DNA sequence: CGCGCG
DNA sequence: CGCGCG
């Protein structure tokens, strides 16, 4: 599905960046060319599945867990 | 914008200055998306034309 | 301004 | 779930 494609693209991006390196949803949205709204829906979903770690803040930072 | 803004002000007035309602209610009653019912409501509240009552969801009435 | 919301 | 957000 398209949703699974976006999940895979996000995970690959965070995996390439660095396991202990985090970035914003805004950065993910721009780099992948996907609406921030869809990036966040996927980001919070993955974080709920424990695959990603959300760093408390504003805006929230994201990294591979 | 003046378009939608006067419709919401009218509804809440016909409702009665003492009575308050939600954006979700206004959205269905007026047949307008909640996203913009809220853009107008928050604007009108800032302009002092409306009073927002704290809560989840917020209640809206004529100031 | 944090927003992901169906 | 409060969301108005460009």
Swiss-Prot record, chain A:
- What is the official name of this protein in its record? Double-stranded RNA-specific adenosine deaminase
* Tissue-level expression: Ubiquitously expressed, highest levels were found in brain and lung. Isoform 5 is expressed at higher levels in astrocytomas as compared to normal brain tissue and expression increases strikingly with the severity of the tumor, being higher in the most aggressive tumors.
Q: Which disease is it linked to?
A: Dyschromatosis symmetrica hereditaria: An autosomal dominant pigmentary genodermatosis characterized by a mixture of hyperpigmented and hypopigmented macules distributed on the face and the dorsal parts of the hands and feet, that appear in infancy or early childhood.
Q: What is the lineage of its organism?
A: Eukaryota, Metazoa, Chordata, Craniata, Vertebrata
Which species does the entry assign this protein to? Homo sapiens (Human)
In the induction comment, the record states: Isoform 1 is induced by interferon alpha. Isoform 5 is constitutively expressed.
Could you describe the post-translational modifications of this protein? Sumoylation reduces RNA-editing activity.
| Top-level taxon of origin | Eukaryota
Q: What does this protein do?
A: Catalyzes the hydrolytic deamination of adenosine to inosine in double-stranded RNA (dsRNA) referred to as A-to-I RNA editing.
| Record text on subunit structure and interactions | Homodimer. Homodimerization is essential for its catalytic activity. Isoform 5 can form heterodimers with ADARB1/ADAR2. Isoform 1 interacts with ILF2/NF45 and ILF3/NF90. Binding to ILF3/NF90 up-regulates ILF3-mediated gene expression. Isoform 1 and isoform 5 (via DRBM 3 domain) interact with TNPO1. Isoform 5 (via DRBM domains) interacts with XPO5. Isoform 1 and isoform 5 can interact with EIF2AK2/PKR and UPF1.
Q: Where is this region: Interaction with Z-DNA?
A: 1-65
Its UniProt domain note says: The third dsRNA-binding domain (DRBM 3) contains an additional N-terminal alpha-helix that is part of a bi-partite nuclear localization signal, together with the sequence immediately C-terminal to DRBM 3. The presence of DRBM 3 is important to bring together the N-terminal and the C-terminal part of the bi-partite nuclear localization signal for import mediated by TNPO1. RNA binding interferes with nuclear import.
Give the signal peptide, or none.
Answer: none
Q: Where is the Z-binding domain?
A: 1-65
């Amino acid at each position: 599905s398209i949703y699974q494609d976006q999940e895979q693209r996000i995970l690959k991006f965070l995996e390439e960046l660095g396991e202990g390196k985090a970035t914003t949803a805004h950065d993910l949205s721009g780099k992948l060319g996907t609406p921030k709204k869809e990036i966040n829906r996927v980001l919070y979903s993955l974080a709920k599945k424990g695959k990603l770690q959300k760093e408390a803040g504003t805006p929230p930072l994201w990294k591979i867990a």
